[PDB]
């Protein structure tokens, strides 16, 4: 009751450090930090957020309910939150060199997938038709996915999605098939965005297609957010009606998302001779809130702001150029070493390596390379048969580049990857002429292989150890 | 790189602190912290997170992609993430004293509204019927809300919702109306959860009603999560099939959400005599991922974990008892002063004050009180004429209680609130027999009153300034 002692014990609790309260978690965090430090990060969706950003996530901004938008709030005392949110929005539009009279932005999305879902809610409405790249061809779940057996992605549950595909030769999106199919399916909205594609998108062509079908062109630039900001790859802003993005990945911020949308005259009705105006702002705004979300995560919005500020520095622009340089280096190196690079190469931060040119699959390689502290993700290539046996490894440069790695370094990486593949091959051949993934993992745990793995792992960790790990 | 130095300054940026990189944000955070410190926070959905929690939010856990669940990943190298997620789940089931064979919990929801949407996705499926308390009667948007014009809440867009009402004469939920209407509408899922109700729910009765209609009984304990943890209030776990919650509010963690669900026997099939098992785990799990969400917010999950650990301390249990004590104190004081308290009082952390007993509305009062550094939120009382003129103020104790306030302190607060109300009335009468809430705000900003308001504000701030403000 009174037990002031306890009440203090209580006041005390709330103020005692992480280290001291719940050590278990403190350790976990530190163990993970160590893991990040000693490993070679080639997962294209990963990056390391700056200290500034992390510092903002840890703020008291966590505490404040700010339902609604700046200047239309449903709670009081949002004067500082409003500075923040407005600042964030302003910085975002700056970072992408967008005219405030032609663009607005909502910065409340909790993450990427929330952002996309919000746009579909605002513009497509239930059962509305969406087309995105088929998942095995480098699409993302949120861009739609269903099998004959189940509607899998929420996009494909609450909307009718159909995929457009990448030509299993060229390795490029087959915009022509898209065109024909779009005329049959009548999409309400077409997504211009990938999770695994080495090439820029023909936005201008996509927009032709969309306008032809009276659909919206929504770009998901999550993967190339940062690349576009630094102008190292074409901007989708120039042709799309709406652009969604993640604030992490190449934008190197905390996990959150953003929706950019067109403001101004959509078209003039010669029938009325007057201008019909983009309504996207109210729809999207209403979709996010009070449609889908509740309380904004202000501590996340702060982190995004911090990220955006960094995005407009010259160091950032350089970083992005380097990111793409590194990717090219890595691609060239593997290609020289005889590996097949889907599409031939890369215009961006990732490549898709068709391990079939070495006679193995990403399914296996992923797991081995993992055991050697080389983090990548498997990923099907055009013309893959079973997605239980993906042919490909998706490799990207953002994470390592943020560590400092340059072209020569990326070449050394390509070599470490190669050793990884050799090991994979060894295991597979003892695995027997068509062993299961199961038997493969068992043999990998096998004593003979564990020795080879430990070898490579050590070299890999020491190499990674030599570069810093942003954010502390 | 060409400009090594520039590259060196790049590495620098990523590691240099917030205070130094982006002072603008730094100030904003500090100004907000100050705002929180000097104000009296009585917004029922607010609380102050412990430093430990905020520390975890700040961590590099932000960086890791861990799509999927522990031992069903889509990424390699989730070994520590897996510890964390599993740890979190373990702690969640502990904190709620749930039988792990009959309950599971998913801890990935980005926030509360995401959690609920995920449950409806898993169990209700599109256009499925949901019943929740009508919003102006103390429901939440995510429990459905739709007007003769427009489906507002995403719940009400993608599912068919119809509300059950609070008896305007008693201020209680009208469980009978529920019963009758449920048999007309046939809900697939019935929500047991409020955003503004002073009383416990008959989970008991609701379960009869749900079972009667073959519906699921989903409790949204967002507001009372902490109360339930400390057992200061009857638990929904005992009757509901699923329980969703926010990890802030009374749980005093960071902003995120969680979904508890039943595992085990649904019912012996007397027809067969074997066991019909609960499939809730896979449904909910699949809904959250890969249905609705992408990358888990691991840094948020960490924060939640830390919170849950604190929830299991005796200091926490004390805090909760105090929270309810404080609410009673505040309620009793106002009631004594002649103010009308919806339902007569409170079993929990909040009261709904019908300012009609003092001849005014929450619309006005909220703004006055705001200007005096007393945060609450306006709110309709059951049977208010129109949503445009809310008669009510929702007041809660969690935030201030976490600061240290006890019963006597809460009484002083009730008195400060009263002065607020007096000022409200003064302005209103000069606002005259008519006049918009706009005109009221203008008169309030008027020189005359700004003097009085600055007086009250100063007193209020000095009182608040005397208590600590959790988080470092
Ligand atoms: C009843 C209820 N449901 C859900 C929420 C979740 O809102 P948010 O997603 O901002 O945590 C709240 C708060 C609430 O009071
Ligand atoms: C193309 C694409 N869509 C959506 C997302 C969503 O990311 P998250 O799961 O953190 O929202 C990402 C990342 C992405 O790269």
UniProtKB/Swiss-Prot annotation, chains A, B:
* Gene Ontology molecular function, alphabetical: aldehyde-lyase activity; glycine hydroxymethyltransferase activity; identical protein binding; mRNA 5'-UTR binding; mRNA regulatory element binding translation repressor activity; protein homodimerization activity; pyridoxal phosphate binding; serine binding
Catalyzed reactions per annotation: (6R)-5,10-methylene-5,6,7,8-tetrahydrofolate + glycine + H2O = (6S)-5,6,7,8-tetrahydrofolate + L-serine
Instruction: State one Pfam family annotation.
Output: SHMT
EC number, as in UniProt: 2.1.2.1
Q: Which residues form a coiled coil?
A: none
Q: Name one GO cellular component term.
A: mitochondrion
How is this chain's activity regulated? Inhibited by tetrahydrofolate concentrations above 40 uM.
The record's listing under SUPFAM superfamilies reads:
PLP-dependent transferases (SSF53383)
Gene Ontology biological process: carnitine biosynthetic process; cellular response to leukemia inhibitory factor; cellular response to tetrahydrofolate; dTMP biosynthetic process; folic acid metabolic process; glycine biosynthetic process from serine; glycine metabolic process; L-serine catabolic process
Entry annotated with the keyword Cytoplasm = yes
Localization terms from the record:
Cytoplasm
Identify which cofactors the protein needs according to its UniProt entry. pyridoxal 5'-phosphate
Tell me the route in metabolism or biology where this protein functions.
One-carbon metabolism; tetrahydrofolate interconversion
Post-translational modification N6-(pyridoxal phosphate)lysine, affected residues: 249
> Which key words are in the record?
Acetylation, Cytoplasm, One-carbon metabolism, Pyridoxal phosphate, Transferase
**Its principal location?**
cytoplasm
Disulphide bonds in the chain: none
- Job of this protein: Interconversion of serine and glycine.
Note the HAMAP family from the entry: SHMT
> Which additional comment does the entry carry?
In eukaryotes there are two forms of the enzymes: a cytosolic one and a mitochondrial one.
* Annotated family: Belongs to the SHMT family.
Subunit text: Homotetramer. Identified in complex with ABRAXAS2 and the other subunits of the BRISC complex, at least composed of ABRAXAS2, BRCC3/BRCC36, BABAM2 and BABAM1/NBA1.
What is the protein named? Serine hydroxymethyltransferase, cytosolic
Q: Which organism is it from?
A: Homo sapiens
């Amino acid at each position: 009751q009174g037990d002031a002692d306890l009440w203090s014990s209580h006041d005390a609790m709330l103020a005692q450090p992480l280290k001291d309260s719940d050590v278990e978690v403190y350790n976990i965090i530190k163990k993970e930090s160590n893991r990040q430090r000693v490993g070679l990060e080639l997962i294209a969706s990963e990056n390391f957020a700056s200290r500034a950003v992390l510092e903002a996530l840890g703020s008291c901004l966590n505490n404040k309910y700010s339902e609604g938008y700046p200047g239309q709030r449903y709670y009081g005392g949002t004067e500082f939150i409003d500075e923040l949110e407005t600042l964030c929005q302003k910085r975002a539009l700056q970072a992408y060199k967008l005219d405030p009279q032609c663009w607005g932005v909502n910065v409340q999305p909790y993450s990427g997938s929330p952002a996309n879902f919000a746009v579909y809610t605002a513009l497509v409405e239930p059962h509305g038709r969406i087309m995105g790249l088929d998942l095995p061809d480098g699409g993302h779940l949120t861009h739609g996915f269903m099998t004959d057996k189940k509607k899998i992605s929420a996009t494909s549950i609450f909307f009718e999605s159909m995929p457009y595909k990448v030509n299993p030769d060229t390795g490029y999106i087959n915009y022509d098939q898209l065109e024909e199919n779009a005329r049959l399916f009548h999409p309400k909205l077409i997504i211009a965005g990938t999770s695994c594609y080495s090439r820029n998108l023909e936005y201008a062509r996509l927009r032709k297609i969309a306008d032809e079908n009276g659909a919206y062109l929504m770009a998901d630039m999550a993967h190339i957010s940062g690349l576009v900001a630094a102008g190292v790859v074409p901007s989708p802003f120039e042709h799309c009606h709406v652009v969604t993005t993640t604030t992490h990945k190449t934008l190197r911020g905390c996990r959150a998302g953003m929706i950019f949308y067109r403001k101004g005259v959509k078209s003039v009705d010669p029938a009325t001779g007057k201008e019909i105006l983009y309504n996207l702002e109210s729809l999207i705004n209403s979709a996010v809130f009070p449609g889908l979300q509740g309380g904004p995560h202000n501590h996340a919005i702060a982190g995004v702001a911090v990220a955006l500020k960094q995005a407009m520095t010259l160091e950032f622009k350089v970083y992005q150029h380097q990111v793409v340089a590194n990717c090219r280096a890595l691609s060239e190196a593997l290609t020289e070493l005889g590996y097949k690079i889907v599409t031939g190469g890369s215009d961006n931060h990732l490549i898709l390596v068709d391990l079939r040119s070495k006679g193995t699959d990403g399914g296996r390689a992923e797991k081995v390379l993992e055991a050697c502290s080389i983090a990548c993700n498997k990923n099907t290539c055009p013309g893959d048969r079973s997605a239980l046996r993906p042919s490909g490894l998706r490799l990207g440069t953002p994470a390592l580049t943020s560590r400092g790695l340059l072209e020569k370094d990326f070449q050394k990486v390509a070599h470490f990857i190669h050793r990884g593949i050799e090991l994979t091959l060894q295991i597979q051949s003892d695995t027997g002429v068509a062993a299961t993934l199961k038997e493969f993992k068992e043999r990998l745990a096998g004593d003979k292989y564990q020795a080879a793995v430990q070898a490579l792992r050590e070299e890999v960790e020491s190499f990674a150890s030599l570069f810093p790990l942003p954010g502390l």
